């Protein structure tokens, strides 16, 4: 299968630099032109830069010209975006995307057929902080019960939450983080389960905050 896997995103101070990578597999990378596309939180897609298969043709959006440099290493199956002089409005999820071309007697046309998973760049002067994970214990309701985990006081985004290492997805709701007054994020993840099984089954939320290298598996059980 065709895969594009981005990396290099994270926190960076205003004015600093950061380098993104996009690792291609499952197709002949040397034959394809590539693009970077970005998306600010809650906003639309914005094309960033283009590079042809052999790097002979390169284009930049006016918003990033003179600050960003696109490149590629076909022997390493990698596409790069070097970002310098970063500003607050550069905060976004960055995607790499592969170009598919069509040709006829009138010219050429294209679309983007495969996209990476995206990597978040946060331009901010604030410091990295790992979260605390607290349980949301199932109530004495037997019906349908709810339990979850509060992932509190971290920076920057994002965090990943799974339940039972991925075995439990049915009924899981992971909410968008809220930015607290302190400048630290907080989010919750919840699951609804048959309350008839609160004693037999063991529920664990797996919290991972890569920006701080934090990995927590907190068991959630009802209180007496």
């Amino acid at each position: 299968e065709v895969q594009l896997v981005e990396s290099g995103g994270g926190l960076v101070q205003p004015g600093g630099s950061l380098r993104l990578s996009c690792a291609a597999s499952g197709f002949t990378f040397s034959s394809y032109s590539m693009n970077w596309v970005r998306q600010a939180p809650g906003k639309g897609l914005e094309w960033v830069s283009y590079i042809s298969s052999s790097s002979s043709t390169i284009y930049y959006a006016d918003s990033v010209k003179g600050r960003f440099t696109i490149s590629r290493d076909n022997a390493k199956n990698s596409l790069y975006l070097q970002m310098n002089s970063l500003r607050a409005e550069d905060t976004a999820v960055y995607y790499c995307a592969r170009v598919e071309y069509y040709y006829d007697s009138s010219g050429y046309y294209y679309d983007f057929d495969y996209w990476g998973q995206g990597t978040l760049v946060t331009v901010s002067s604030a410091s990295t902080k790992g979260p605390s994970v607290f349980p949301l214990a199932p109530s004495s309701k037997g019906g349908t019960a709810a339990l979850g985990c509060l992932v509190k006081d971290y920076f920057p985004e994002p965090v990943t939450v799974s339940w039972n290492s991925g075995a439990l997805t049915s009924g899981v709701h992971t909410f968008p983080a809220v930015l607290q007054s302190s400048g630290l994020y907080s989010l919750s993840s919840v699951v609804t389960v048959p309350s008839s099984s609160l004693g037999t089954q063991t529920y664990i939320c797996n919290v991972n905050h890569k920006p701080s290298n934090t990995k927590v598996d907190k068991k959630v059980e009802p209180k007496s």
Binding site: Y59, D111, H173, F175
Partner: protein, 203 residues
């Protein structure tokens, strides 16, 4: 300047038409970005369907047309002008107008572990409701709380077309210990009268 996607409410089983909103048609593509995912190609060369794209999707000159809208179509649709350099239009977020569904409400006390740290978070969960308009109100010892809560809401579910909401009331440990009755009161079109879930500190 960045732009938030536009909302287009549609009734399931009814047609929808999405304008490119850019501000022949071989140069036009459509993409769908489902919640929490990256964009996926829908229409290319103006009106060719990418593989696996259902019958109901088609392009015409310039809009995207869904003959009958289904729950799995929720997401943000993006028109791309594939010129020498590409450009994307403002997104259009489909809102699926399903039947009214009341929220299931749950209240969570602060964990003993968190209280050891000097802060207390009380959480109120509103599960799987529609429409989006639900309101949470916090009361502590039967006194309305103001300015000390925050909430977030999931995007509309691809299967049942509902929303869920989580609200957090934040108090210091000292304040939490000074009061007894903690309640969140929920108003929503699916509830003929507001629902209150509560607990007393110390059970």
């Amino acid at each position: 300047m960045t732009q938030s996607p536009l909302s287009l409410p549609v009734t399931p089983g009814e047609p929808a038409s999405i304008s490119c909103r850019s501000s022949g048609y071989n140069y036009l593509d459509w993409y769908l970005q489902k919640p929490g995912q990256s964009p996926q190609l829908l229409i290319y060369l103006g009106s060719n369907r990418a593989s696996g794209v259902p019958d109901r999707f088609s392009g015409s000159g310039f809009t995207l047309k869904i003959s009958r809208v289904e729950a799995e179509d929720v997401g943000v649709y993006y028109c791309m002008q594939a010129l020498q350099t590409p450009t994307f239009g403002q997104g259009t977020r489909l809102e699926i107008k399903r039947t009214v569904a009341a929220p299931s409400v749950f209240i969570f006390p602060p964990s003993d572990e968190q209280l050891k740290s000097g802060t207390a978070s009380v959480v109120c969960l509103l599960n799987n409701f529609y429409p989006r308009e639900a309101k949470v109100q916090w009361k502590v010892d039967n006194a309305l709380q103001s300015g000390n809560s925050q909430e977030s809401v999931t995007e509309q579910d691809s299967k049942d077309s509902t929303y869920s909401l989580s609200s957090t009331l934040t108090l210091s440990k000292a304040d939490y210990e000074k009061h007894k009755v903690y309640a969140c009161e929920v108003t929503h079109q699916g509830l003929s009268s507001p629902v209150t879930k509560s607990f007393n500190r110390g059970e």
